[PDB]
Design goal:
Chains A, B: 3CL-PRO exists as monomer and homodimer. Only the homodimer shows catalytic activity. Interacts with host FBXO22; this interaction promotes the proteasomal degradation of nsp5. Chains A, B: It comes from Severe acute respiratory syndrome coronavirus 2. 2 copies of one chain form a homodimer. The first copy, chain A, has about 300 residues and is an alpha+beta fold. The first copy, chain A, folds into 3 domains: about 110 residues, Trypsin-like serine proteases (Thrombin, subunit H, Beta Barrel), CATH 2.40.10.10; about 80 residues, Thrombin, subunit H, CATH 2.40.10.10; about 100 residues, main proteinase (3clpro) structure, domain 3. Chain A has 8 helices and 13 strands. The first copy, chain A, has a 7-stranded antiparallel sheet with strand order 5-4-1-2-3-7-6, with no helix packed on it. In chain A, strands 8, 9, 10, 11, 12 and 13 form a 6-stranded mixed sheet that branches. In chain A, helix 3 packs parallel to helix 6, helix 3 packs across helix 7 and helix 4 packs parallel to helix 7. At the A-B interface, helix 1 and strand 10 of A face helix 1 and strand 10 of B. The complex binds ligand WBO (2 copies).
C-alpha cells in the first residue's frame, strides 16, 4: 500500500556522469563506451551566449581545449564533433561501467527519472514528466546542465533527456540525447517563452485508478459519460483531450478495478466542477498528472483493495 | 529553480541488496562486508507469524537453511545470529561493493531515501520522513521487507531504516539497522495501531522558506508572533510544538531570506486559520511537512530570488 513519486534506481546512470570543462565553463557529461555527450554550449564564453555561432566556435577548438574528469581521473579527448545541440567527445577510455542503453525521444505526458548532477557528481534523483508544452518542471541550479533524464527496463537504460537551460518562468528545457530540443527552444541566452501548458488528462485518470487500487473511493459516482461530452469539460478546464488511444491504454487499470474508463471520466468531471471539498486523494489536495498508466501499474499492487 | 521531492542517488545501496530465502519465505537483505542483515521474520512460516518465539525458531535452523542470492550468484552462509529484530548472516564473501557506511537511529521528523526492493532487486527510490508516531508513509508491497532507508553524506551511506511490515492503516513500520523498531511495534502478525500522528512544524516552516527562496511570497505578512502564542495555534491544528532548538536550526534559512523565524510563524498561523484560497505553494495545495531544513538547504539555491 501507499503511493509515492518513485524514481528508477539511479546507479546505472551514476557510473556514467563526468565533468566537462572548456575554459571557464564547466558542466556535466554522459560517458558511454568511449564517447562523452554534453550540451554544446560548454564551448561558449559569457559573451558568446547571446547569439553564438556554434560552428565557428567549434572550429576554433581542438581536443586539448576540453577537460573531462571522471572522479579525479582525467580522460584524454581524442576527437570531437557536434550533433545538433550536443557535443560528442571521443575519449581514449571506454567507460567500464557502461550499462545496456538506448537513446529515446519521448512524447509529452511521459515521465522519467532525473539524476541531478553538479561538477560530474550526482546529487539527487527525482521524477519528472515532459509537459504538453515540452518543458519539464525540474529542480535545477546553475551547474546542472548536462544532467540526464532516463527510464529503466530490465537493466536497459533508456536515456530521453539532457538538461540545457532554465527559462524565465523557472521551468526547464533540454534535448534528447541526439541533441534535438524538446519544444521550440534554442540554445542561446535569450528570454524564451513556452506555449501555454495543459493538464495531462490520461495521467490524472491513471492516478485516480491508483487511488481506487489503494482503497480511496470517495470520489467515485454512479454516473457515466461519453468521450465527446467529457472532452467538452476537458476543454473548459484546460485538460488535454482524451483519445480513444488513451482509453485503450487505461484498459488494464480499468479491468483491475472494475471501473470503466468513461465511468472514471464522470468522476473526474465531478472533481473538476466541484473540487475536493477539503478531501485528499493519495495525500494530495490537487489532481496529480505526472503519473502515467505505466507508472501506476509499476508501483501499485496487481490486486485491488 | 524548482523544488521536488529529491532522493539521494541510490547506486551505493543498490550494490548491497541481496535476496534471502528461508523455506517458502523470501525477502531482501543488506550485504555489507561479509554480513547480510535482514528482518528476522524470514525464519517464520505462515503459522509461526501469529505469536513467534524467535529464539526457538532460530535454534532449529542451521546455516544451510538460509539461501542468499546476490544477482544469480549464491552466497555461502557460514554463520547466523539474531540481534533484536534483525537476522545477521555471515557469508564467505565480503561484498566488493561495500560503501563507506554507518548505522544511525534517526529522530522523528527526519527524512531519508528508500530503495524499494523485491527479490533482492532494486525497483524504485523515493523520499520518506519518520512520522512523529514512528511510522513512515511508504510505498511497499508484499516482498518489500528488508528494503532500507538511508541518507548519504560525502560518499558515506548512513543507513537508518529497514522495512518490516505494513500496518492495517497502510502505513509502514520498521527498525534501525541494529533491529530496534521505531515506535512501539513488534514483529508479529497482530493488528497494531500507531499513536495519533501530528504535523512536523519545523519542516513546514523550512518548506515555506524554500518557497520564498524560489520566489513564492504571496503567503507572507507584516505580522510577527511569539513562540508561546504560535504554539497555542500549533496545538489547535495538531502541529508539533516549535522549540527554541527548532528556531535555531532554521537560522540559516531565516538569514538567507531576511525573514525572522517568528515572522514566518505568523505567516503559517494565517495559512492554518484561513487555508490557501485556491493558491498553491511550490505546486502543492497542502502544507508539506516532509522536507527538513537540511533538505531545503541541500536542494535550494544559496541566493534568494
Ligand atoms: C518567476 N519565478 C518564480 C521563476 C524564477 C525564474 C528565475 N530563473 C532564472 O533566472 C534562470 C534564467 C532565466 C533567463 C533569464 C534571461 C534570459 F535571457 C534567459 C533565461 N536562465 C538562465 O540564466 C540561463 C541562461 C542561458 C544560458 C545558456 C543557454 Cl544555451 C541558454 C540560456 Cl537561456 N542559464 C542556464 O540555464 C544555465 N545553463 C543553468 C542555470 C543557471 C542559473 C539558474 C538556473 C539554471 C538551470 N537549470
Ligand atoms: C485503510 N486502507 C486505505 C489501508 C489499506 C491497508 C491494507 N494493508 C494491509 O492489509 C497490510 C496488512 C495489514 C495487517 C492485517 C492484519 C494483521 F494482523 C496485521 C496487519 N499487513 C500485513 O499483512 C503484514 C502482516 C505481518 C507479517 C509479518 C510481521 Cl513480522 C508482521 C505483520 Cl503485521 N505483512 C507484511 O507486512 C509483509 N511483511 C509485507 C506486506 C504484505 C502485504 C502487503 C503489504 C506489505 C508491506 N509492506
Amino acid at each position: 500500500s501507499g503511493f509515492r513519486k518513485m524514481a528508477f534506481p539511479s546507479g546505472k546512470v551514476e557510473g556514467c556522469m563526468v565533468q566537462v570543462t572548456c575554459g571557464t565553463t564547466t558542466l556535466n557529461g554522459l560517458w558511454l563506451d568511449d564517447v562523452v555527450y554534453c550540451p554544446r554550449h560548454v564551448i561558449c564564453t559569457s559573451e558568446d551566449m547571446l547569439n553564438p555561432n556554434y560552428e565557428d566556435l567549434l572550429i576554433r577548438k581542438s581536443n586539448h581545449n576540453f577537460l573531462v574528469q571522471a572522479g579525479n581521473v582525467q580522460l584524454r579527448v581524442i576527437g570531437h564533433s557536434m550533433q545538433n545541440c550536443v557535443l560528442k567527445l571521443k575519449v581514449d577510455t571506454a567507460n567500464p561501467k557502461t550499462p545496456k542503453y538506448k537513446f529515446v525521444r519521448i512524447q509529452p505526458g511521459q515521465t522519467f527519472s532525473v539524476l541531478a548532477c553538479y561538477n560530474g557528481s550526482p546529487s539527487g534523483v527525482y521524477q519528472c514528466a515532459m509537459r504538453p508544452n515540452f518543458t519539464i518542471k525540474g529542480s535545477f541550479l546553475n551547474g546542472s546542465c548536462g544532467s540526464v533524464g532516463f527510464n529503466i527496463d530490465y537493466d536497459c537504460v533508456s536515456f530521453c533527456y539532457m538538461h540545457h537551460m532554465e527559462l524565465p518562468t523557472g521551468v526547464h528545457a533540454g534535448t534528447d540525447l541526439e541533441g534535438n530540443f524538446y519544444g521550440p527552444f534554442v540554445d542561446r541566452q535569450t528570454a524564451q517563452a513556452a506555449g501555454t501548458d495543459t493538464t495531462i488528462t490520461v495521467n490524472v485518470l491513471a492516478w485516480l485508478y491508483a487511488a481506487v487500487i489503494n482503497g480511496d473511493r470517495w470520489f467515485l459516482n454512479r454516473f457515466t459519460t461519453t468521450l465527446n461530452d467529457f472532452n467538452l469539460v476537458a476543454m473548459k478546464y484546460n485538460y488535454e483531450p482524451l483519445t480513444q488511444d488513451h482509453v485503450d491504454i487505461l484498459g488494464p487499470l480499468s479491468a483491475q478495478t472494475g471501473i470503466a474508463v468513461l465511468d472514471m471520466c464522470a468522476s473526474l468531471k465531478e472533481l473538476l466542477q466541484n473540487g475536493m471539498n477539503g478531501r485528499t486523494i493519495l495525500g494530495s489536495a490537487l489532481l496529480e498528472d505526472e503519473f502515467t498508466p505505466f507508472d501506476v501499474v509499476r508501483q501499485c499492487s496487481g490486486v485491488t483493495f
